[PDB]
Design a protein around this ligand. Structure first.
Ligand code: CAP
Ligand code: CAP
Ligand code: CAP
Ligand code: MG
Ligand code: MG
Ligand code: MG
Ligand code: MG
Lengths: 109, 467, 467, 109, 116, 117, 234
């Protein structure tokens, strides 16, 4: 039968799923908090896989207890940087590695 | 046991003529055509050839008895008169696998053709064929890439490739060389090449040519959107110089170089073929000097042996002749050794000069290159004879176009594509070739100009190298 | 000026036949013997040879006009019929110095003999001689040492040197090889040698042979108080292997190695000759395969051209033939090219096959090596023909002695010294040779045994390679 | 006399002939089938000679008996990828090499 | 679990476990369950054996994986709900649906020789 | 192989920390690898090219490109793909590198292929 | 032709069990002894071994049709029950010459014994023999010297040679090692040797051992007038 797979740029974890509802985003942030990871919001004007560094939004939310606190910063970041990709990351400081990472905003087309 | 040492001269045929011997699959077999001197019997002459190309000399030596001569000696196991010819015979001789250095064409030739051609008791000797055993074939690298890998590297599928030797042979500066190259390549040829005798000379030093030619390749490739190449000649006085030149070609990102395997030699060639494999550079082989060796059928070595040796030593292309052009090539013979250099298994067929069945144990094939005195009118015959897996080269047939190189190149490229299309459609290239060319000439002015220029030009002479 | 481009095929002789040309002293001259196809005039055939070995191709190309063709083109300046022979001519062709890469025999051959031997319009072609201009000769190293430096290194003065090829050709282990070597050398021979096809094989790997042979040389030299050598064969599949083998010989302190210059090739040979100079190792050159090329007088290259090329590429010894032994050698011809490889200035002399006067500008000479099917009865003739500056080699003529190697060696050494003494005393070696040998046989039992064994053995056949 | 040859980008085999009629295309596909080659349709947004790989349309037509079957896929590919170059290739699986290859569609200017 | 001795590594980096061999989309929830995030899951036949070829085969596996990771993170039990999570994703991924259909029946259940 | 023993199986070794420190260990290890590849938040996905043996270098890179463009992080040589008559290693490395570049450019994710050395 | 791609799992024995195959002289042959799991037929088990040590995997892939599978596939051409033993068979499998890297034992083993020993469907597997074709044997160097060249180098003819491993296995200093070596060699042994686990360790670094052992060899050879050696572990 068979379709030829289309070409579409992707953005790593969760980018092959339907776009996450804001409730699906909150669920992922809940998982972070429960797991003890520290939320970090970063933004970049480009999504080039070869690059290591995005720009940090403020500082990591080191004692984030509320998903809402994270979501509020994501909103703040967007109003300031709507022309940028914005990604939410969780950081494990014991293993010292990034544990979660997904794009929550893509720029205007 | 060691059967007693009796000093003195014996007949070779007492030890080396073994008509009841059945060759093993690990034996290297050789077919010689010889005429003995008056008074020398054919079996003694055949035995002398077997003896002095393997283990024997002119008198009995005691040292034979320190080893197992039966295991090591060459064995003339069959002699047959050449039908219709007085005092001419074929001797078939088997050589044990143990006699040969692995991976060395130099050593193989040193035994088989080292001393026996000058033997007083023999008037003339010509090596016709060698069966290389599969166990020996596997000790060689063979082509650095071979036909299918080359097509894949160059993105060249579906028809013969086209080349062109720059002319005059010698005399052009490096800049004028690259100029001629650019104009040829931009016009539709896949390759251009150094003449075989273009190495490094007062009028044009090699490193300058490499530089200017690389520029020409980049410009023409950018304009045409097709991969272009130029066989840069690395043939040199010494191994060191050869490698220095190969190295710079790689540095320039050049896809292909060339080497004159016979005038440089098999030892240098085998070095170059290994380097080409390790460095991903294609290797075009020019057969300069071969006709000194292979032209006359009474004495020398037939080209089909040299072709086999080259496939073992290593080369991605090898000139095969044209049959129809300015240099000699027997058609039946040519079809035979084109199969020997391309295919994996070639059945014995004396009508095409193939004395032995040859297996290659998946050693890559070598692209045959038809070059020399050919022009557009030859195209349907060339495509017919060689098929798609060949390179057809037009030196004078490009640069001698009335309008210059780029139109000369387009004339050849159009003529080729017209023939391939027609063939694929079921048209008979032999019967309809002229028409196919006239048709294409109707809409290609530059092809029409070429067809007009060379309409009368044929090369039809008696073939010396008859089967 | 650039005289207008007219595309199309012209006769070669319009550009390349120049009967009024007088060769410059910097020109490379070549003498070809050819037979044109019926209907092809001799001057057109001669012009075609000149054209396609220098600057020309089959049709007119516009690129000629970018350069100065008069400066670069080969020039057939003389044609003469071969007296007494139908449809056979000599063409003399001059090539400008500019056409050739300095120090490259490979390049020179690629032009002169690259493509022209296979030309349809020519039935047969044989290169007879090349005059190498002094300005080109000086771009070559030549022999690593040459005759006088070799005698000085080896402390060998006053007579021919004596050698011996170990037999059987193939089949002996390394230890048995060194055994045969020790026994030969202890008996009075100066040298032994690997057979040309002894490289590295299953029955005897090269590094083992080098090891055991070095031991044999030390033992025999210690016993005899004379410098001993054994030509260790470094002929190899690749340049890298060749050098690896040469290197170990040097490490062992071996005075001399050998190389098959034709089956390995000139590019590898020139590399080896330079290394030998830098490392003080003598280089013996075996001419394996030459008779494939040089035997028949209608087609090929005469040996005297190959000898000249080898002296340029580099070699301290070169096999010259025996005239009287088992392999062919015309006496007049041989005397000619022995002069070409030894002397500094050789006058043209067609009676000895020397077409051109050759100067060498103090490039060292090469020792001629007489080898193949010779025994004690040949000694006075060999000393007569070659004189003191030669190496005479007896393989079967040593190891085939009824008592073995050491007495076989003494037989040859006594026979030689008896002949040199007699010659120096004024005795005629031709008329008195048998007597001189009988005399020495009276007090040398081992010489007497050899004289008895080979009394009847002669090699007398029709020479194919007549002048 | 003589004309200066124009500069025009080419596309390998058959690109120096007049553009192939759909009947000339079918004749080439007939040759494939008769020869035992397997048809493959590929497309690319660019025609850069240095690149090895185009994108495969579906899978090779391994037991293609009809030229029409190939032509139908070429039509399908075009409706989906009219902004791309489209090339028909034949594959010899015994020699394992591509035997035929010609551009059947070039993108809108 | 067959660990006879306590082992310390003194901060020598860990090695990524690679699960490979005879696995397909239906195995995904079990694999994610067993190995967790720090693993590589490899599908040779399970990609190239997709009815539509390699690229759709790859998308089938990539979608199946991301669906399982999302579900796990949301608190869904991969063991009990794995089939459902896969069916769900199959609803909007045709290429995953094609793979689920193809290999629905394929299991490898034999006696383990290497018992503790 | 001791005669007096019927069968022997080594179950475990405790490597002392003092000995563990004499080794380099992983060139990079898990966390440095995720950081190099920008791969966080889930298992990585790979794929062995098939058939195990028999494909040419060009057909190998073809299969690789199509796999990687579809969403896999890695492809790999089969363990017995080294260098063989049907596919020499240097050709595979060449064609596979091209496939990685094309697929990475199309997807915007880091791609890799374990080239068997 | 390329016979159509039908995705899905097939039995290995449909492709890889070839009881009518006659091995070529260039084929590498392997003899395996195996016991299939209950419910797995011997010919399917033999075919699975042939498949997964050559060209095959667990499901049908389309890429097969890009090449000539008949030329490349391993071929289980004979199965026979092991006489007197329940559920044990010999499978004989032929592998084309083309499958192997020249001069590489590493590659040969990677195919023949790489993955098949851990297959769930097989209880146990033991490789009994391999016939190495002569064409493959010639791609290898083999022994650096071998028996006859070794006897010639060492001047040792006419009887077995004698050696001796120094003991204790570990624990001796370099000097005490050479001491034990000298005393052994002077007494009539041709060789002594490092223990297999003597490499370089705190109690005895390798370069010191090499030094002291060389001294012991020279002294003992000088005393006895026979060539002595000691296998220095590298
Ligand atoms: O020097 C030459 O004559 C050529 O450049 C041809 O030039 P044209 O294309 O101008 O004739 C070729 O090298 C010959 O074809 C060699 O012969 P072969 O291919 O038989 O070895
Ligand atoms: O293989 C041989 O036949 C020889 O060893 C001679 O052995 P004998 O001394 O036992 O005859 C010589 O190499 C030839 O002389 C070569 O010929 P040339 O010197 O003419 O190149
Ligand atoms: O050759 C094979 O069978 C594989 O390529 C899997 O292919 P499929 O993905 O087509 O099954 C793997 O290397 C094995 O997983 C090795 O076993 P393990 O990982 O247990 O060492
Ligand atoms: Mg030429
Ligand atoms: Mg000899
Ligand atoms: Mg695998
Ligand atoms: Mg031990």
């Amino acid at each position: 039968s068979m379709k030829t797979l289309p070409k579409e740029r992707r953005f790593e974890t969760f980018s092959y799923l339907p776009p996450l509802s804001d409730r699906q985003i909150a669920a992922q942030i809940e998982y972070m908090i429960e797991q003890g990871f520290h939320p970090l919001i970063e933004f970049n004007e480009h999504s080039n896989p070869e690059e290591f560094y995005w720009t940090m939004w403020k500082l990591p939310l080191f004692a984030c207890a509320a998903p809402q606190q994270v979501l509020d910063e994501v909103r703040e970041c967007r109003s300031e940087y709507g022309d940028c990709y914005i990604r939410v990351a969780g950081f494990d400081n014991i293993k010292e590695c990034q544990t979660s990472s997904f794009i929550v905003h893509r720029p205007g087309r | 046991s060691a059967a007693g040492y009796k000093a003195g001269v014996k007949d070779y045929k007492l030890t080396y003529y073994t008509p009841d011997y059945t060759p093993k699959d690990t034996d290297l077999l050789a077919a010689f055509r010889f005429s003995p001197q008056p008074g020398v019997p054919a079996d003694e002459a055949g035995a002398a050839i077997a003896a002095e190309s393997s283990t024997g000399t002119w008198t009995t030596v005691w040292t034979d008895l320190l080893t197992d001569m039966d295991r090591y000696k060459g064995k003339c196991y069959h002699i047959e008169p050449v039908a219709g010819e007085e005092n001419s015979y074929f001797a078939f001789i088997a050589y044990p696998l143990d006699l040969f250095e692995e991976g060395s064409v130099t050593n193989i030739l040193t035994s088989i053709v080292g001393n026996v051609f000058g033997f007083k008791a023999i008037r003339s000797l010509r090596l016709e064929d060698i069966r290389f055993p599969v166990a020996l074939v596997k000790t060689f690298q063979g082509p650095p890439h071979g036909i299918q890998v080359e097509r894949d590297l160059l993105n060249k599928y579906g028809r013969p490739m086209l080349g062109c030797t720059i002319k005059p042979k010698l005399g052009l500066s490096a800049k004028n060389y690259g100029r001629a190259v650019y104009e040829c390549l931009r016009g539709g040829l896949d390759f251009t090449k150094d003449d075989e005798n273009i190495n490094s000379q007062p009028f044009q030093r090699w490193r300058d040519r490499f530089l200017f030619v690389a520029d020409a390749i980049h410009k023409s490739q950018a304009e045409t959107g097709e991969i272009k190449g130029h066989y840069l000649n690395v043939t040199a006085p010494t191994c060191e110089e050869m490698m220095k030149r190969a190295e710079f070609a790689k540095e320039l990102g050049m896809p292909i170089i060339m080497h004159d395997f016979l005038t440089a030699g098999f030892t240098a060639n085998t070095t170059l073929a290994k380097w080409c494999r390790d460095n991903g550079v294609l290797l075009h082989i020019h057969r300069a000097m071969h006709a000194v060796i292979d032209r006359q059928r009474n004495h020398g070595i037939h080209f089909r042996v040299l072709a086999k040796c080259l496939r073992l030593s290593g080369g991605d292309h090898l000139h095969s002749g044209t049959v129809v052009g300015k240099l000699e090539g027997d058609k039946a013979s040519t079809l035979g050794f084109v199969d020997l250099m391309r295919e994996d298994h070639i059945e014995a067929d004396r009508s095409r000069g193939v004395f032995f069945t040859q297996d290659w144990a998946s050693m890559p094939g070598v692209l045959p290159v038809a070059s020399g005195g050919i022009h557009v009118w030859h195209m349907p015959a060339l495509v017919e004879i060689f098929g798609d897996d060949s390179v057809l080269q037009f030196g004078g047939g490009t640069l001698g176009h009335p309008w210059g190189n780029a139109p000369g190149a387009t004339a050849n490229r159009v003529a080729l594509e017209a023939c391939v299309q027609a063939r694929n459609e079921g048209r008979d290239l032999y019967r309809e070739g002229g028409d196919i060319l006239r048709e294409a000439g109707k809409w290609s002015p530059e092809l029409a100009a070429a067809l007009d220029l060379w309409k009368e030009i044929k090369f039809e002479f008696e073939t010396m190298d008859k089967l």
